[PDB]
Symmetry: D2
Subunit: 332 residues, 4 copies
């Protein structure tokens, strides 16, 4: 007479549920699943929705996650090619589209991914008009600009995963040189998540001790041992990892979960993520690139005004120019 009927007696009317913290991940490839597992691992969603054009793959992924439910704290995991499954998401993570082939610039993916975005972004906003969108697909800064224009969402609700990842890499490498935890090394990689990123040497410090003060040659061509190479390693890292295993995913998955945690827990932590920087540091157009931003439940609510050195501002502007040159010709 129905398992449930007999065993479970209702105290409240049957009625409507509605996820408080529903997250959607679009794209169930390497990056998508890594974000998904990291999100689940930290119990950040009470509902996880997945979307992809590959129906079988999408279903298999859902089922595999569902089978590990005993070990998780996410009561509902759903998956469909139709965006109606993403309704009422607080956060949508977009990792859908093509990735770099070996040695390929992220900037070379632009047209293919813009085509993808033009089609899926409107479906996303239709079903969650008040969500926050975390853009991850490459090139991430330009795609965040693209998402902003297509979605019609406010700036503080369209965020590029950006240099949160580059900065974690930088902090890891710095840590390795000093023999301490990356959380105790402070340093910011800003600008494009790509070849034109900028190391803010003037802010690199341990326990408040400015490394640039200790080594005024930090970041130059005349440095003993030997910073610039550290920034070069950050720049090259995706290519080196792609050459070895075909793609990257674990670090970006962790990076994404870290941003989500700040926002779903309303913490107001600072992260270098991609936002609209017109009017900052002499940038004249609607360029998106990473700066230290404050993240909480409203999304990206603030940017940190820094006192960048002239060479730092110069490299930032150069990064802004590289990006704007591509953005400026994007067609609608």
């Amino acid at each position: 007479a129905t398992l449930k009927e007999k065993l479970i007696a209702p105290v409240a009317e049957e009625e409507a549920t509605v996820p408080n913290n529903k997250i959607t991940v679009v794209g169930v490839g390497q990056v998508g699943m890594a974000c998904a597992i990291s999100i689940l691992g930290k119990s950040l969603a009470d509902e996880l929705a997945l979307v992809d054009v590959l129906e079988d793959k999408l279903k298999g992924e859902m089922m595999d996650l569902q089978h590990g439910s005993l070990f998780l704290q996410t009561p509902k995991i759903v998956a469909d090619k139709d965006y109606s499954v993403t309704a009422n998401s607080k956060i949508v993570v977009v990792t859908a589209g093509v990735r770099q082939q070996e040695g390929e610039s992220r900037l070379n993916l632009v047209q293919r991914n813009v085509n993808v975005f033009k089609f899926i972004i409107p479906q996303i906003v239709k079903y969650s008009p008040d969500c926050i969108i975390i853009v991850v697909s490459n090139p991430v800064d330009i795609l965040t600009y693209v998402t902003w224009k297509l979605s019609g969402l406010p700036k503080h609700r369209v965020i590029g995963s950006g240099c949160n990842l580059d900065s974690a890499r930088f902090r890891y490498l710095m840590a390795e040189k000093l023999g301490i935890h990356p959380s105790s090394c402070h340093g910011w990689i800003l600008g494009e998540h790509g070849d034109s990123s900028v190391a803010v040497w003037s802010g690199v410090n341990v326990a408040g001790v400015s490394l640039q003060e200790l080594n005024p040659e930090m970041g130059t061509d005349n440095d003993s041992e030997n910073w610039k190479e550290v920034h070069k390693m950050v720049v090259e890292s995706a290519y080196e990892v792609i050459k070895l295993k075909g793609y990257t995913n674990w670090a970006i998955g962790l990076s994404v979960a870290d941003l989500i945690e700040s926002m779903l827990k309303n913490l107001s932590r600072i992260h270098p993520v991609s936002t609209m920087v017109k009017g900052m540091y002499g940038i004249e157009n609607e360029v998106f690139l990473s700066l230290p931003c404050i993240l909480n439940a409203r999304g990206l609510t603030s940017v940190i005004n820094q006192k960048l050195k002239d060479d730092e501002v110069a490299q930032l502007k150069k990064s802004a120019d590289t990006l704007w040159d591509i953005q400026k010709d994007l067609k609608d």
Copy 2:
């Protein structure tokens, strides 16, 4: 031209957070702070409000928690004698009132505590019309009933901590006899939180093996395993600990946090908490007793139907009459 103005540039123009995962703990005594710290430890609240009539102690408890903020994930902690600080809480935990003296029964506190609740409950609902209330103060089953009536809330939104603690103690004691983790021990203490709780022997098992089937004398006075002594120990628990350190708090604090987790994570896990059992097991009055109940974001949405023996039913009935005998003379 403040520092904040210089350092921080608003992206989305202005802060103001949408009421969300806010929790209030009423009473900042041994139990109240134990609940507060456990709620804080598991990052269950994005805002924690404290209320007590002891203004000085209240402010100091508040400050001390705040001083720990670096190590926590709750961006806002506030406290006031006035209930306006509790506005828009999702969940309110009531631990205020008088407690048992060494030896004293929980029912000796009824009158004094009915007077406390007559004041506090209407304040809670006035400022948080949509909250879930968890009642901890003793006598707990009676006060859960008093809260239900004063609150005007539907039954699924009024939960008595009931036998959640009794059962935790029971599983701990069972675990000590077997040498395994209490989470691997299963057994249910239901009914009245104190003296008259019921041990449902038929459900005591490890890995699905019925210990009663293995030992049909389980629960009788002629049992080589002395299971009845275990239940007796669960019963004398409050007493022995009160005699030793003056009160109990850590275990109940942990148990309240566990209920909150099930709810804010929408888990639909089952806990032995106290609900309105009229029309169950032959009970014909409005009384709150513990049964295995399903907790989720809406609250306590259902109860598990069990096949109870005659003597178990009888105790439940006996508890219901005793409780009703007190409740029928409660005015206003």
Copy 3:
């Protein structure tokens, strides 16, 4: 006069950590990385070593994890084709080998995988003479036996993941029928990891209530609740997911991490993993099958004695003969 020399003043003269909570994952395929990321997510290792014959992929997996270090609590991650990087591990997880093709049985991989293990197992014990080994590779019960023999380790230090995953799936499926969290559902799938697993119907319960007692037709072909279809679904699981996405990894990855937690935290929780069952249930050969076992810091220290029905015993025996039929012809 390095920066490190200038910034950091040694207190206790010199670094060198005492081997402690080190874990090795052998194989960096779908399952291996899923285990790695889940182990990393729960901070189970103070050092993670990876080993695989695919040198390029191995290095890239290593780098990607390292890039995530800021978000983790594992200060050292290393990887090498050579087993010296695995020296002094407390726990070694073996997931290397060939996997099932869509449709293909787990036993079709025996020969190829026996050759893999003949090489890997002696390397593991040579570099970590005091480790605990968790076998994941298929066919898992057979390979657990092969590992026990090649390793020379006592039985409490060789654990086959066995039916830990089967049972997780089963609890998920039960939870889906009842609408509660799988942790509130109890039921044991024992015996052989694959096709021939056994559902112990007598132990399936919710809150201590026997569902079999409630539905004596549970498990037969004439059951309105279709419990046998549930078990059938647990059995077809690998198959359906493999057909959809090519392999399974997330659920097993989570389940391995859960076993490790029980062990490194010394919990003595009970899990359905595979141990040497000779002399149990009438089995007279050296074979590994899943039963409810207690895991703690020493490993798998005990097994739960159960009262099994004749048909359950018979399947267990039938599985033991089949396994033995393969194992008896294994040489060296």
Copy 4:
């Protein structure tokens, strides 16, 4: 015939356990229990031992914790006035002795607490000669010196909880002024955990932006709004909280757990804790006070060399002098 005997079948010989991560907390008053609950909350110990001269209180506390075991991951909690229960602790936390009465300097507790320490320290080292001792009792810097001399342990194994707490308070207050999470505000309070502590203004920063650069008057008498008062609030905080609730405990409990996490997880994170600073910043005697130190499994292995301003060095030396003046007359 013995519950266990029948139900649980041994796989490994009965034999010896031994905690990997055993922690002892000495003193079960406000501070001791707060450290205990925070340690348990984060699953940092596989064994927790408690010691106090108050036998009944000590037992009650043990039992209360034990009753919440279902919600914890610490299989063994023991308590006794005899130090033999503390054997093989990796970490011993000493919170035993007298605390400040209202308005009383921590320095006024010195003789009474030195008497306590002279008696208990030798018992502690007898039973755990290789432990790391975290000193918390006041005055904490002087008591760390005292512990070092009495215990005969190496410097990197005797650590004063020190200014980890003052700095968290500083970061909280700073955060409140800027509207962000304390984890995103960086600033160090060093020297005595007491009235002569030192704010290192030159290291105060957000996202690497030096606040002193933005406000060169930071910390002086001619400051717009208005740092010095922030340091004053940190200095006064214990007195204000003591005046309100009688003592402090939650923040210090969290602070202590944070240090333990760094060490038991071997993270090498930086914390401002109390260590022996002879030969640093012109300090000529064996003074203990807080500086940023690197913590991992070996204890306190490194100190960070800072580039302190002349006024900062001056205040540091003044703090060192205040302390040494008391240390110098300590009698053995």
